[PDB]
């Protein structure tokens, strides 16, 4: 899950807090080969805006910060082998690379994780899109947790 | 989840029991717009070959039978509105339509659900592919349950 304050990017061009996200909204997602694409939210696998939860915080070199639960799958780019893989949030470390949306081009491009933090906050939201992936706070991730 | 005896279709052209499925295997899946495509199994969300479980059994007009847990998402085709939607297995009824792989063409084509049964067996397997979907026993389904 992500936090209610975490944001998705609607096809319309607007960021929307996950706590305000609605089934049907077409949010920025990622294809199997790592490309940006818009997909509709079909349901929420978890949505409790009061539930206290522990979150991993991934900071990218570009300034993006993704707050996700320990067991949530996140896309990790292996620069050497040109391999896109999914790793649990808690297993991600500095120097690993994640896909972050580039403002100018709109493309999902790899960025170094420069800091791995933690935080405990209230509210959990886990949206499921048709694609099965979702870009939260500009960082690509799986919908699975 | 599906049963261990349920089968996936490997890109190689061979059916493989889910209980024998391995991470890395490229199984027949479905794209967001309902097309057949091969995707690799990245992990199992559930895999307990001993766990007794209640399953819904969907029979198609073509003879395919998909055994899935009540809370598993399955693709349902709405012929009138040309809409592909996901519905929980237990909410599916006769006359609804699901996507079934055609032998000759290999395409995922809609077929009427001619009978909805039930069964309790041992073993649960829930494979997750990169696409997020998987065709089990020739019937298209989401990986989510």
UniProtKB/Swiss-Prot annotation, chains A, B:
A cellular component term, taken from the record's GO annotations: nucleus
Spans through the membrane: none
Disruption phenotype: RNAi-mediated knockdown severely reduces adult survival following the ingestion of E.carotovora. Abolishes Cad99C-dependent formation of endosomes and DUOX-dependent up-regulation of reactive oxygen species (ROS) in the intestines of adults fed bacteria-derived uracil.
UniProt entry keywords in alphabetical sequence: Autocatalytic cleavage, Calcium, Cell membrane, Cytoplasm, Developmental protein, Hydrolase, Lipoprotein, Membrane, Metal-binding, Morphogen, Nucleus, Palmitate, Protease, Segmentation polarity protein, Signal, Transferase
Recorded consequence of changing residue 46 to A: No cholesterol transfer
Cell inner membrane among keywords: no
Induction entry: Strongly up-regulated in the anterior midgut and the posterior midgut in response to bacterial uracil.
Site (Essential for auto-cleavage): 72
Domain of life of the source: Eukaryota
Tissue: In embryos, expression starts at stage 5 as a few stripes at the anterior and posterior ends, this expands to 17 stripes during stages 8-11. Expression is also seen in CNS and some PNS cells until stage 13-14, and in foregut, hindgut and salivary glands. In larvae, expression is seen in the posterior compartment of the wing, leg and antennal imaginal disks. In adults, high level of expression in specific regions of the proventriculus and hindgut, with slightly lower levels of expression in the posterior midgut. Relatively low levels of expression in the anterior midgut region.
Keyword Lipoprotein: yes
UniProt-listed GO biological process terms: analia development; anterior head segmentation; anterior/posterior lineage restriction, imaginal disc; Bolwig's organ morphogenesis; cell fate specification; cell-cell signaling; compartment pattern specification; compound eye morphogenesis
GO MF terms, alphabetically ordered: calcium ion binding; cholesterol-protein transferase activity; morphogen activity; patched binding; peptidase activity
Effect of residue 72 to A: No autoprocessing activity
Localisation: Nucleus; Cytoplasm
Site feature: Involved in auto-cleavage: 69
Site, Involved in cholesterol transfer: residue positions: 46
Subunit and interaction comment: Interacts with shf. Interacts with ptc and CG5504/l(2)tid.
Family classification: Belongs to the hedgehog family.
Protein name: Protein hedgehog
Species the sequence originates in: Drosophila melanogaster
